Structure formats: C-alpha cells, structure tokens
Amino acid sequence: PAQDNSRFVIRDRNWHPKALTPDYKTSIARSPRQALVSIPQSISETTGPNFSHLGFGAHDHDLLLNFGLPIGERIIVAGRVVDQYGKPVPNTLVEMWQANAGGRYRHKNDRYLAPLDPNFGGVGRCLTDSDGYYSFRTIKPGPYPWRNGPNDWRPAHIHFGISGPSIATKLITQLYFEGDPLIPMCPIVKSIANPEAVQQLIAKLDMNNANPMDCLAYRFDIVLRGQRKTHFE
Template structure:
C-alpha cells in the first residue's frame, strides 16, 4: 500500500461498540460471554457467495403496502424509506441485497411469539427486500411502525424502528442493524440505544426527506448506510 493509500485508510473504531454486559439492557446479562472469546477459521462457503446478481424479485418485494395484500391496504402512516449503501469514501455498493422487517402500525410483529395486545393487520406482512442499483440506491414503501412495550422494566418502550440487513459478498459479511425515525422522543429513553455513543445513535436515525415524499400520499425518510470509516452506520453484530 502506498503512503497516499495509507493516509486514506480509516481503521475501525472498536470503542463505538457497547460493552457485552450492560445491566440496564437486561437480556445482555444472560447473553454476555463469561469466558474469553476464540477465533474460528471460516469455511470456504462462508468466504464465498451468495451471488444475488441473478436473484428473481417479485413486483412488490420492496413494497410492503402491496406484498401481503389480502384485499385491502395496510392501516397506518404510509412512508417511503430510501437511501444509498456505500463505503467510507462514498463509493456505491451495487447489487447488494437489503432486507427489512418491522412491526405494524400498532407495534406488533407478524410472529407467533409476539403476544402484544395490538391487533395484526391482515394486509401487512412486515417484510421486504431490495437490490441496490448501480449507484448503491435502494427504496422501500411501507407503513411507519408503532412503538411497543417490552419486558425490560416496568414501563419500557422500544422506539419505532425497522430492522435492516445488508448482505455483502459472503454470508460472513452480512450486517444487521435497525433504523429509528428523526424526532422520536423514545430514542434517548431506550436502554438499547443508550448502550452506544451518541454519534453511533445518530448513525441509526433516518432523516425526514421531503424531496422523496409523494405529495398527498406519504412522507419519506432517508437512511444512508455507510459500511466503514468515520461516517459508518452502527452495526451491533460487527
């Protein structure tokens, strides 16, 4: 690597990640490792594939208003979520798979273990996928998820959020995070959000984007995903 290249390289800041044991986030107590971590040598299958270039998409894979349609439209605030997947220098990451999953407008997931009292929406499945274009852009149309209570304390609520998965060139490079919405007062109260630094939290907040909003239809939020560097998005599994 040349001297110029070395000056451009941004090393990973491991201090951005939360401690494994954060007692205010109660499930971390049982999940935090009790012994020293070991390094596993990845197999060939983990270092190669999958190749998404020939993946067949349905017409509504990235449209959560229509991909679980059972005769009607979902209930809730219609929104567009879009952005760009890029590296630390702004270079686009094309043809990479972006997947999302979320609760409905009432704050309930379509999952057998979700027992929250909010009703399921018969026209909302809560999952979608998109492939970034040549410039790293992706877009989803969906319903803004509702907050929901969780058993971390007597009155703890998760902010509205959408889970996001980005699949790189191999299974081992898959990264998972979640986005929050600008202006949500529950974000600074959330025990999960409080486990990381303020700049890491800011990297998880989707900003209102009136330029992408559809007049008389829906607002839009922008969530750019930076895979490394000083402006990187926070990924808990990194």
C-alpha cells in the same frame, strides 16, 4: 468461485455496542465472558454470497402490496449503501422487517394487545442498484412495549439486514425516526456508548422524496466496512 482480492477495515468495537450492556437484560446471559480471538483475513472472511440471481418478486420491496391497504402512515424508506471509503455497494441484499402501525408484529411470539393489520405482513427485500440505492414502501411502525424494566417502550424502528461484499461486512441494525422522544430512553439504543453512533441510526424526514398527497419519505444511508485491495502481503 470467489477470490481473496480484498481486505476490510478492522471493526471499531468501541463504536458498535458492546456484548454486555446490563440495562438490556437479555444481554447478561447471552454475552461471551472470554475475549474474542482476532484472526487474519483469509478467503473465508473476505468473500460472501452475491444475490444478483435471486428471484425477487415484483412487490418484494413494497410492504403496501406484498401481504386491502394497510392502515398507518404511508412512507418511503430510501437511502444508499456505501463503504467507509464512501464507495457505493451495488447489487447488495437489503432485508427489513417491522411491526404494523400499532406496534404489533406478525409473529407467533407477539402477544402485545394491539391488533394485527389484515393487509400488513411487515417484510421486504431489495437489491441495491448500480449506485448503491435501495428503497422500500411501507407504513410507519408504532412503539412497542417489552418486558425489560417495568415500563420500557421500543421507539418506532425498522430492523435492517445488509449483506455487503463479504461475511466480513454483513450487518444487522435498526432504523429510528427523526425526533422520536423514546430514542434516548431505550436500553437497546443505549447499548451504543457514543451519542454520535446513535445519530447514524436515525432516518431523517425527506420531503424531497415524498409523493405529494400520497406519502412521506425518510432517508437512511448505510456504511459498511471499507474495502481495499491487498498490498505488500
């Protein structure tokens, strides 16, 4: 079983978005009014699941083949998962989901008028390698209109879920694409107060990782809470 051998650097709650960000309407009723109660890290918080023995399908990370060829811009989304100390996070679970080239999600609740793509699902999963590297093959999603303000549009984005070494490091985020004009107008993006934090959410064009005459590539690195050994406890 797991063992309490690590400590994780305290989260910076001024870096991450706050709970109550009124321009993001839904956050109003779904944010706690009482302050969070801080607790010391115990085995409960410093351990988490290891997905090394999960039975991944051969095309789990290939959205092009996992659901005809989908219509849209063929891209590779790759990067590395490191900790705050810059140490790689190997054998970790990275899951993603997104819309099709038109901004339509393959979900019951999605009633946006753009049509579904018969050959596109929009889900993938990848376990990072020894070096903390992951990669997905997909099509670039399109902007999505949503009922917030009267004319709100989500920038093209990919949802990401990362496990890390413990439930303390587990994170859900979104990737945005370099140069997208919608980025700076998005209420959700704006939930993040520091422009420098927003920058970490933008995937950069990576021509070096592109396959000529085939597909482009985007680089997205993820930084999880720094892990250290206990000391003088």
